[PDB]
Amino acid sequence: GSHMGRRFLVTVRIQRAGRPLQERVFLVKFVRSRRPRTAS
């Protein structure tokens, strides 16, 4: 299908409000592998 394209954001938005401590863990994994992205 097409849709708007914001279904993935809805899931993450709910997690951000879930538990307080958690974003710190994501930063660790994100920082551990920091790399930009380019279109193809």
Q: If you count them, how many residues does the chain have? A: 40
Domain of residue 23, CATH code: 6.10.250.60
The range of the structural domain enclosing residue 23 comes to 5-34
> What is the rounded distance in angstroms from the CA atom of residue 36 to the CA atom of residue 13?
23
Residue 40, in any domain of the structure: no
- The SS3 of residue 30 is helix
Residue 38 has φ and ψ, to the nearest 5°, of -130, 145
Residue 11, in any domain of the structure: yes
Q: Read off the tokens for 26.
A: 């994501």
Total domains in the fold of the chain? 1
Cβ contact 22:15 at 8 Å? yes
Residue 33: DSSP 8-state: T
Residue 39, in any domain of the structure: no
> What is the rounded distance in angstroms from the CA atom of residue 32 to the CA atom of residue 24?
12
Cβ contact 16:23 at 8 Å? yes
DSSP alpha helices (H): ranges in 1-40?
Answer: 7-17, 23-32
